[PDB]
Amino acid sequence: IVLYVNFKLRSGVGRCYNCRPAVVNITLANFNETKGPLCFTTQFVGAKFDRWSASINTGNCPFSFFSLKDIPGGCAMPIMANLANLNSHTIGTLYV
Amino acid sequence: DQSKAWNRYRLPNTLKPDSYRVTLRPYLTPNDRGLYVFKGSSTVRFTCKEATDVIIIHSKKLNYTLSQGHRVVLRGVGGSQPPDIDKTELVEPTEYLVVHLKGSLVKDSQYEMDSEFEGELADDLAGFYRSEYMEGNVRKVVATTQMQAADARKSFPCFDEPAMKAEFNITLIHPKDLTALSNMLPKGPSTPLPEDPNWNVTEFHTTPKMSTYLLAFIVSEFDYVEKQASNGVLIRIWARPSAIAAGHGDYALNVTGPILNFFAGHYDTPYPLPKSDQIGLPDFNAGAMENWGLVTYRENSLLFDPLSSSSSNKERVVTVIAHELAHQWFGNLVTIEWWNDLWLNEGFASYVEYLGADYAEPTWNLKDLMVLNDVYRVMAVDALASSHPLSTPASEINTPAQISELFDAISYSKGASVLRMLSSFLSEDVFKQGLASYLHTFAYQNTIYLNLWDHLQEAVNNRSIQLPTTVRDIMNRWTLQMGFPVITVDTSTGTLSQEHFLLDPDSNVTRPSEFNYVWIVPITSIRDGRQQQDYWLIDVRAQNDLFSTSGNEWVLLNLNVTGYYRVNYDEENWRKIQTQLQRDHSAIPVINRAQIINDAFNLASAHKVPVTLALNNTLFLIEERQYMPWEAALSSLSYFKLMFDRSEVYGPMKNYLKKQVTPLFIHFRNNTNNWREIPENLMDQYSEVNAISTACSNGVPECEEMVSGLFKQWMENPNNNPIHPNLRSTVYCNAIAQGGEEEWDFAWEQFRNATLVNEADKLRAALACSKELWILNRYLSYTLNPDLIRKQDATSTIISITNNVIGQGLVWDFVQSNWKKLFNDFSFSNLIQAVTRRFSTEYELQQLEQFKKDNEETGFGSGTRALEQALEKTKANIKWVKENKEVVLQWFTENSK
Ligand SMILES: *[C@@H]1O[C@H](CO)[C@@H](O[C@@H]2O[C@H](CO)[C@@H](O)[C@H](O)[C@H]2NC(C)=O)[C@H](O)[C@H]1NC(C)=O
Ligand SMILES: *[C@@H]1O[C@H](CO)[C@@H](O[C@@H]2O[C@H](CO)[C@@H](O)[C@H](O)[C@H]2NC(C)=O)[C@H](O)[C@H]1NC(C)=O
Ligand SMILES: *[C@@H]1O[C@H](CO)[C@@H](O)[C@H](O)[C@H]1NC(C)=O
Ligand SMILES: *[C@@H]1O[C@H](CO)[C@@H](O)[C@H](O)[C@H]1NC(C)=O
Ligand SMILES: *[C@@H]1O[C@H](CO)[C@@H](O)[C@H](O)[C@H]1NC(C)=O
Ligand SMILES: *[C@@H]1O[C@H](CO)[C@@H](O)[C@H](O)[C@H]1NC(C)=O
Ligand SMILES: *[C@@H]1O[C@H](CO)[C@@H](O)[C@H](O)[C@H]1NC(C)=O
Ligand SMILES: *[C@@H]1O[C@H](CO)[C@@H](O)[C@H](O)[C@H]1NC(C)=O
Ligand SMILES: *[C@@H]1O[C@H](CO)[C@@H](O)[C@H](O)[C@H]1NC(C)=O
Ligand SMILES: *[C@@H]1O[C@H](CO)[C@@H](O)[C@H](O)[C@H]1NC(C)=O
Ligand SMILES: [Zn+2]
Numbered sequence: 001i002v003l004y005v006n007f008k009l010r011s012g013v014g015r016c017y018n019c020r021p022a023v024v025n026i027t028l029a030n031f032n033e034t035k036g037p038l039c040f041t042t043q044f045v046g047a048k049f050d051r052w053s054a055s056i057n058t059g060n061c062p063f064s065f066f067s068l069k070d071i072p073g074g075c076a077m078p079i080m081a082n083l084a085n086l087n088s089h090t091i092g093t094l095y096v
Numbered sequence: 097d098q099s100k101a102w103n104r105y106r107l108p109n110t111l112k113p114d115s116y117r118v119t120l121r122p123y124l125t126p127n128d129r130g131l132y133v134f135k136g137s138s139t140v141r142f143t144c145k146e147a148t149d150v151i152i153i154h155s156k157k158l159n160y161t162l163s164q165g166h167r168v169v170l171r172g173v174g175g176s177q178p179p180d181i182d183k184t185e186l187v188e189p190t191e192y193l194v195v196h197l198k199g200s201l202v203k204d205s206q207y208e209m210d211s212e213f214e215g216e217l218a219d220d221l222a223g224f225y226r227s228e229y230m231e232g233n234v235r236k237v238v239a240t241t242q243m244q245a246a247d248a249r250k251s252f253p254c255f256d257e258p259a260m261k262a263e264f265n266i267t268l269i270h271p272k273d274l275t276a277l278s279n280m281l282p283k284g285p286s287t288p289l290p291e292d293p294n295w296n297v298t299e300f301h302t303t304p305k306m307s308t309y310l311l312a313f314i315v316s317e318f319d320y321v322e323k324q325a326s327n328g329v330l331i332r333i334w335a336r337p338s339a340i341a342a343g344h345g346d347y348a349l350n351v352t353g354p355i356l357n358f359f360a361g362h363y364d365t366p367y368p369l370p371k372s373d374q375i376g377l378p379d380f381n382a383g384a385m386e387n388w389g390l391v392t393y394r395e396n397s398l399l400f401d402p403l404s405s406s407s408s409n410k411e412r413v414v415t416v417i418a419h420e421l422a423h424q425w426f427g428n429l430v431t432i433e434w435w436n437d438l439w440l441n442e443g444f445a446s447y448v449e450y451l452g453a454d455y456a457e458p459t460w461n462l463k464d465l466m467v468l469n470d471v472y473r474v475m476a477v478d479a480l481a482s483s484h485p486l487s488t489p490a491s492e493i494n495t496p497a498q499i500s501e502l503f504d505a506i507s508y509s510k511g512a513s514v515l516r517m518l519s520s521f522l523s524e525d526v527f528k529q530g531l532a533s534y535l536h537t538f539a540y541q542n543t544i545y546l547n548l549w550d551h552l553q554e555a556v557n558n559r560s561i562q563l564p565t566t567v568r569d570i571m572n573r574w575t576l577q578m579g580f581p582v583i584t585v586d587t588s589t590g591t592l593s594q595e596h597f598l599l600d601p602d603s604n605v606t607r608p609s610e611f612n613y614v615w616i617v618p619i620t621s622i623r624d625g626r627q628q629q630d631y632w633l634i635d636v637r638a639q640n641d642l643f644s645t646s647g648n649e650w651v652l653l654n655l656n657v658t659g660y661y662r663v664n665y666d667e668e669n670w671r672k673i674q675t676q677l678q679r680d681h682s683a684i685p686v687i688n689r690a691q692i693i694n695d696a697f698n699l700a701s702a703h704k705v706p707v708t709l710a711l712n713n714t715l716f717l718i719e720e721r722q723y724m725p726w727e728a729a730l731s732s733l734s735y736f737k738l739m740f741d742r743s744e745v746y747g748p749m750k751n752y753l754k755k756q757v758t759p760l761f762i763h764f765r766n767n768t769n770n771w772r773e774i775p776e777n778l779m780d781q782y783s784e785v786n787a788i789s790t791a792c793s794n795g796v797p798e799c800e801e802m803v804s805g806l807f808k809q810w811m812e813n814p815n816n817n818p819i820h821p822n823l824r825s826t827v828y829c830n831a832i833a834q835g836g837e838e839e840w841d842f843a844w845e846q847f848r849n850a851t852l853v854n855e856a857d858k859l860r861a862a863l864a865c866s867k868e869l870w871i872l873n874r875y876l877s878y879t880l881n882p883d884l885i886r887k888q889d890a891t892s893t894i895i896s897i898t899n900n901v902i903g904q905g906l907v908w909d910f911v912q913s914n915w916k917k918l919f920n921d922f923s924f925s926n927l928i929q930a931v932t933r934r935f936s937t938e939y940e941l942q943q944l945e946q947f948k949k950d951n952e953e954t955g956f957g958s959g960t961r962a963l964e965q966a967l968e969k970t971k972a973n974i975k976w977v978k979e980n981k982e983v984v985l986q987w988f989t990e991n992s993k
Contacts, residue, residue, distance in 0.1 A: 014275035016332075017340045018321040018349075050341060086321070086346050 001066055002029035002043040003094060005054040007081050018087045021052075026079055026092040028068055037067040037095075051084035054091075061096055071095040102152050102187050102194045105494035107255055110148035113262045114141045114206065115302075118252045120224065121269035121295075122217050122239035122315055132217040132226050132237065138252045140262075141173060141208045144201040149179070151209065154249035154256035155186060155193035156223070161212040168195055173206035191246070191496075193253050211253050219379065219887055223250030224313060227379035229336055231317075239270075239315040240377050240392065242385060245435060245503075246496045248308035258307040259433050259542045266300045270315045277314040277334070279303050279389040281370060303388070304368065305540045307431050312387035314375060321345050325353030327360055330371035335399055336378070338851070344399035348374055351414050355452040356421050362451065363425055364532040365539075372424070374398060374417065379888055382503075384416045386423030386445075393420075394888070395853040405854040406821035407774075407781050411453075411462070418452030419445050425535055433542040436493040438502045439486045439575075440543060443511015446470060447519070460778045466516055467657045467687055468727055472694050474509035475580060475662070479698070481603040482964040483578040486510055487545045500958040501925070506578075513660045514574045520658035521618040521630075522552075522561050530555030545575055564632045570616045574660065577609035581617060582662045582704065583633070583653055587669040590644030592619070593637040597662055600972035601703055620655040625683045627655060645669065650676060656687045662695045664704055677716040689720075690728035697732035701972075707980050711987050718756045721763065723783035730790060736984065738934050739977055741901050745985045751992035753794040761791040761799060771802065774822055781822055789826040800834060807831035811842050824855075828862035840866055848884075860889060864896035864903065872903045876910060891923045895930040907931050912943065915951050924959035932966040936973040944970055 007021035031038045042065050046054030058064045060075035070076065079092030097103050120136040127133060140153070151170075160167035167184040179199035186193055193211075201207060217226045217239060227238040241251065249256040268276040272294055276286070280301035289295040303311075319340040320332045331353045333345035352374055360367050373390045376398040384393045397416040400409060426444035450463045477483055484506060493499060519527040534543075534551035549568040556563060563570065581594040596613035598605070605613075619631040621642060628642050628651075645651055650672040653663040665673070673692060676683055684692070696710035714729050733753075740746050764784045768774060775781045791799035806819050806827055819827050832839050843859050850856035866872055878884045879893045894910075897903035908931050911918075918924075932944060944967060956963050 013273050013317050015319050016322050017319050017337075018346075051343065085343065086349075 001038065001040070002045060003027075003056065003065070003079075004029065005044070005046045005056070005079055005092065007047055007052075007054065007091060009052070018083050020089045021081055021091065024081070024091045026068065028066065028094070031066065031068060033069055036069075037071055039066070047081075051086075053082055053084070055080045055082055056094060059093075065094070067095045068092065069095065101150065102192050103190060105190055107154075107257055107260070108146075108148065108152055110144065110146040111142045111151065111201075111255070112145055113255045113260055114143055115263045115265065116140050116252075116254065117265035117267070119267040119269065120251065120313055122224070122226075124217075124226070124237040124239060124271065124274075124315070133214055134217045134224055134239065134251075135214050136252055137210070137212045138254075139208055139210050140254065141206060142255070143206050144203055147200045147203050149197045149200045151195040151197070153193050153195075153209075153253050154191055154246075155253045156191045156247065156250040158193075158213045158215050158250070158253065160184075160193075161214070163210070163212065166195075167193065167211065169210040170195065170197075171208045171210065173208055176202060176205040176207060178207055191249055191256075213252070215250065219882065221379060221381040221888060223247040225379075227377045229378040231337070236317055238318075238377065238379075239313070240375075240379075241312045241314065241387075242381060242392070243311055243387075244309040244385060245499045246309070248311055251311075251313070254308050256308050257434070258309060258431050261305045261307055261431070261540065261542070263305055264303045264311060266303075266311070266313065268298050268300075268313055268315060269295055270298065272296045274315050274317060277312075277316075277373060277375070277390055279306075279310070279312055279387060306388060306428070310386070310388045310428055312385075312390040312392060314390065314392075318375070320373075321349050323349050323353055325372075326357040327367065329353070329356060329367055329369065331356070332371070332373050333398070334373060334375035335395070336376075339376070339395075339399050342401070344401055344852070345376075347400040347402070347410065347413060348398050348417060351456040352417055352421070355414075355418050355456055356424070358452055358455045359421060359425060359448070362528055363535055364528075365425060365429070365535045367424055368429070372421075374420075379886055381888055384420050386420045386427055388424065388428045391420045396857055399853065401852050401854065404817075404821055404852055406824065407778060408785075409821070409854045411460070411778070414453045414456055415449055415462070418456070419449035421452060422448040429540065430535055430538045431542050433544050434490050434493065435499045435502055436488040436490040437543075437545055438507040439511035440545065440548065442503070442507045443486070443515060446508045446512035447515035464656075464687060464724070466512065467690065468724065468731070470509040470512045471516070471657055471660065472728065472731070474505040474513060475597075475660075475698070477505050477965065478510060478579055479597050479599040479702075480965050480968050481598060481605045481607075482961060482968050484607075484961070485578045486514065486575045497955075497957040497960070501961055504925075504961075510660070514571070517574075517618065517659045518552075518571060520620075522556060522563070523559070526555050526559045526561055527552070529559065564616060564634055573611055573615040577611055577613060578607065579613065580660050580662070581613075581615050582664055582699070582702075583617065583619070584664045584704075585643050585651070585653060585669065586666050587643060587645040587649075587651060588666065589639060590641050591637065591639045592633055592643060594633060594661075595636070597698075597702065599698075599702060600968065600975070602975075603968060603972070615661075617661055618659055619653055620658060621651055621653045622655050622685070622688075623651045624649055648672065652684065652688050652691075654688070654691060656685060657691050662698060663691070664695070664699050670705070670709060674712060674715075677713070681716050681720065686722050686724050689722070689725040693725055694728045694732055697735070701735070701976060703979075707983060708987055711984070711991070714756065715991070718759055721760065721780075721783060723779040723786065726760075726783060726786050726790075730786060739936050739973060740981075740984070742904075742934070743981075745981060745988070748985060748988035748992055750794040752988045753790055754796055755992050757787055757790045757794065758796055760787045761796055764788070765798075771806075771820070771823070774820055785822055785826060788823060792826065792830040800830065803827045803830040804834050807835070807839065811839070814842075814846075821854075825858045825861065828858055829865040832862050833865040833867055837868075837871070840868075840871055860885070860893055861896045864893065864900055866900070867902055869902050869906070872897055872900065872906055876903075876906060887922070891927055894927060898927075898931050904931075904934055908943075912947055912950075915947070916954055919951075919954055919957070924957060925962040928956070928959045928962040928966055932970065935966070935970040936977045938974060941967075941970050941974065 004027035006025040008023040010022040056065050057078045059077035061077050074095050076093045076095045078090045081089040081091045118138045122134040163169050166181045170178040179197040182196040182198050184195050224241050227240050266278045270276045276298040278300040283299045286296045286298045318334045319337045320334045322332050333348045369389050376393045376395045380394040384397050400413050422445040427441035432440050453462050530552035552567045582597040584593050617633040621628045696713045699705040700707040700710040809818050847856050847859040879890045898907040
């Protein structure tokens with residue numbers, strides 16, 4: 001199970017550096033949304049550039065790191081885009 | 097010819113503007129003559145209030161395109177019919193565009209005037225001007241503004257006085273790849289320019305009714321960080337992309353919104369706009385400017401690196417932000433009628449900055465710093481006969497030089513001090529209540545000082561506050577006459593007497609006062625450490641048993657120095673106070689320990705106590721750890737340094753300070769785990785820096801080893817600076833003074849390749865600490881090359897060189913030989929004030945009197961009053977060195993053992 005998390009900041013001139021990234025690419029490695037959930041080692045491949053990094057929180061799950069759409073009766077742990085010492089944006093959710 | 101209206105400096109009452117539209121287009125590349133320029137156009141709509149056959153409007157350094165043979169086109173409004181233009185002319189001394197009409201305008205008819213014009217986008221930090229910076233190998237050019245006080249007229253023609261309030265419709269035409277910013281938000285997204293799609297057009301919502309000096313226009317490649325305030329206002333911090341990405345705007349973001357919301361709640365008055373931008377310019381004269389919705393900062397007042405800026409830099413940022421946000425009420429919403437009441441803007445913002453900064457950082461106790469930073473800073477100048485009243489008669493303020501002269505310690509620090517005293521005698525809640533009424537009543541209007549007393553009088557009446565007389569009659573004593581009283585206490589009888597405190601008792605006070613220099617004074621006092629009942633002094637002399645003592649009792653007046661007065665005591669009370677300091681100084685409040693020091697040195701200089709009493713008040717400092725009494729001592733003894741650091745007295749003086757500071761230096765060495773840690777309390781951090789700086793100045797050799805080893809360690813590992821930012825300024829200067837060409841060349845390259853301005857500032861001052869004279873001469877030549885030191889830093893660096901005893905004569909000779917050239921090309925006031933404060937001989941005085949004579953016809957502009965104050969101080973210094981040299985020399989020798 002691999003969870004890819006990437007984002008880019010707004011581009012060009014006059015950008016908000018700490019606002020939510022304009023581009024986000026959350027990819028679960030073999031998930032298909034219409035086929036539904038994906039059911040051995042969890043992996044994380046988050047973005048890391050300058051002061052910006054990607055993280056995954058624990059949310060309701062009693063464990064700490066499968067769908068990008070809600071799994072009724074499950075726990076959704078949010079995928080975050082964090083600016084070191086300033087702002088954190090929920091850019092996604094990984095449901096289990 | 098003063099008979100002609102266009103030769104007079106005030107505008108006629110005949111025309112009032114109603115609204116403007118202005119379109120400006122900066123060209124951020126040089127033209128074939130090598131100039132950066134901006135092209136622009138404007139329409140002003142104005143009402144004729146009194147019939148006149150001339151339009152007089154302000155215009156500075158603008159070249160006009162001729163339309164129909166004239167510099168303007170005049171049009172009617174609502175069916176009014178304008179006369180033909182006979183002639184237009186520019187009158188340079190009064191900075192007017194004059195439009196002569198073949199007939200008179202009609203009373204109450206509106207008219208519109210169209211103009212098309214060009215101007216230089218100069219590196220002069222005034223009007224609409226260019227700021228530059230490097231992004232990699234590429235030099236970026238920014239277009240940006242500074243209109244206060246009288247430079248809006250330099251960007252577009254307008255009725256450029258602060259009571260000529262109007263609304264403004266701003267359009268900026270800019271390169272397609274650059275953002276445009278103004279006071280308001282854009283009316284919609286930026287559109288291409290039809291004639292050339294490499295340019296875009298941005299148009300901004302109409303401003304509120306506003307003064308011309310508050311307009312701002314900026315075109316840059318800046319990025320920003322954003323946060324929405326608790327009152328819904330959008331806050332953005334704008335700076336160079338690399339500074340924003342690194343986080344140097346993040347502290348300003350953390351505090352700007354909360355402070356703005358705090359002031360809105362505190363004064364019961366909303367900030368009436370959707371957004372407040374804070375922007376940091378690489379090139380900026382005055383530190384910060386309060387433009388409504390677009391506050392402009394000097395980088396060192398806005399940006400902050402938590403790993404490389406010091407605690408004093410952080411205090412600077414939050415204080416200036418709080419000062420500018422204060423102006424959004426005192427200055428932008430309610431505005432001065434004319435520049436003679438400047439303290440209504442700047443005194444309020446200098447007081448209220450501490451309330452906002454205290455709100456954002458309540459662990460710092462910044463409100464206490466107002467005594468050193470404002471009260472005692474301004475009493476130095478307000479004790480001269482060459483001082484001026486908080487409110488000056490408006491007839492006396494006319495020219496731009498006279499206006500700029502008022503941006504001084506009187507308008508700022510004395511304004512702040514009387515508001516500190518005015519907000520102490522009556523409750524702060526009572527104070528803010530009357531100010532809320534004032535803000536509500538005069539919103540979008542203009543005020544004189546009498547309007548302030550009325551709304552404070554309502555608050556005292558509504559709060560059942562008892563006072564000896566009206567707010568009006570109390571505060572006119574502190575506002576319409578210069579100076580302050582000294583209160584002299586006889587503690588055997590409990591008698592108080594007051595008189596005008598003057599530095600030199602032989603000074604000639606020529607400005608009359610309608611109160612004959614008598615004040616109405618709120619007296620706080622403590623007895624043996626317990627606060628007594630308040631008292632009001634209403635006569636020149638009075639008695640109350642509050643001020644009577646017996647036995648071992650001592651009393652102090654002016655608890656925590658809330659009043660704007662100096663206190664002198666009889667001989668017995670002084671001796672008991674000195675005994676208290678030796679036995680247990682903690683029984684005297686920390687602020688009043690600084691009061692005891694600072695008053696005695698100033699009283700001694702005025703021949704009101706013996707100079708040995710003032711010096712004896714410094715004996716307890718060997719066991720003092722607080723920042724404030726030491727700082728008041730080091731500040732008062734900087735006069736002794738200035739008088740003696742070229743004389744045999746300086747050795748013994750340094751010997752005394754070595755003996756007084758060395759235990760405190762050893763304490764901090766210990767308390768910091770050998771300078772590896774810094775204190776938690778902010779005042780303790782400042783006390784540490786003062787202890788290190790004083791140790792190294794006066795020759796504690798453990799300090800000289802410490803600073804040179806750190807700086808040697810830095811030079812050996814340049815990318816890993818081992819010096820904590822709190823110590824960089826003292827470490828850098830002393831390492832440069834003790835070092836050679838290698839230490840200087842290293843710090844110069846570190847200044848040229850600097851990315852933080854807070855770091856370049858420390859290196860720029862420290863490089864003036866060279867003891868080699870040939871180095872200081874090279875450095876002085878650098879300060880006037882804009883490729884090496886920014887024009888915004890030239891005076892500041894020259895002053896750092898003059899503070900060096902080796903540089904004193906170099907700069908004074910430079911000033912004397914280059915005055916004409918310098919002036920015809922920059923704070924002449926601060927340079928005059930700094931280059932002359934060592935003067936203590938008749939020889940220095942005749943150079944100063946001759947420096948006056950040699951340049952009388954060029955004039956001195958806004959330096960005019962600093963020159964008269966220098967003449968008065970120099971004369972007092974000659975007498976003071978005569979009367980004190982031997983007494984002071986002997987005291988230092990005896991007490992440094
Ligand atoms: C500046 O812009 C404002 C708003 O766009 C203009 O105000 C309008 O002016 C016309 C003519 O006086 C009125 O009929 C409208 O009702 C006004 N609108 C509002 C909202 O008041 C103003 O005239 C412009 N001024 C200049 C000099 O261009
Ligand atoms: C005088 O100023 C001092 C601050 O320098 C005040 O003393 C502080 O008082 C508050 C409240 O009592 C305490 O929390 C602080 O810890 C005290 N600080 C110090 C240095 O002791 C004092 O209250 C002021 N006095 C008056 C009446 O204004
Ligand atoms: C999203 O991420 C995956 C895995 O890193 C990558 O293969 C794909 O190209 C990305 N999509 C876009 C639009 O960049
Ligand atoms: C996802 O699954 C649906 C079947 O549910 C299929 O139609 C679609 O092509 C699949 N996408 C991919 C890329 O496999
Ligand atoms: C404005 O006109 C004067 C007088 O000819 C000239 O010296 C100046 O350079 C002009 N301004 C610009 C920006 O060219
Ligand atoms: C300039 O206008 C173009 C076209 O409308 C637009 O795409 C771009 O965002 C604008 N640029 C700025 C800096 O406003
Ligand atoms: C800004 O505030 C946040 C939250 O208190 C904090 O984490 C961050 O360190 C602050 N940044 C600065 C530069 O003070
Ligand atoms: C004082 O009271 C009157 C009547 O209640 C009120 O109109 C006025 O606004 C009050 N002034 C202040 C400053 O509170
Ligand atoms: C200063 O202290 C010395 C030492 O006791 C004393 O003799 C002298 O009178 C003091 N000076 C004054 C005027 O307080
Ligand atoms: C600090 O002072 C204490 C007591 O004098 C001593 O034990 C300790 O070694 C000192 N530390 C240093 C190195 O300053
Ligand atoms: Zn100000």
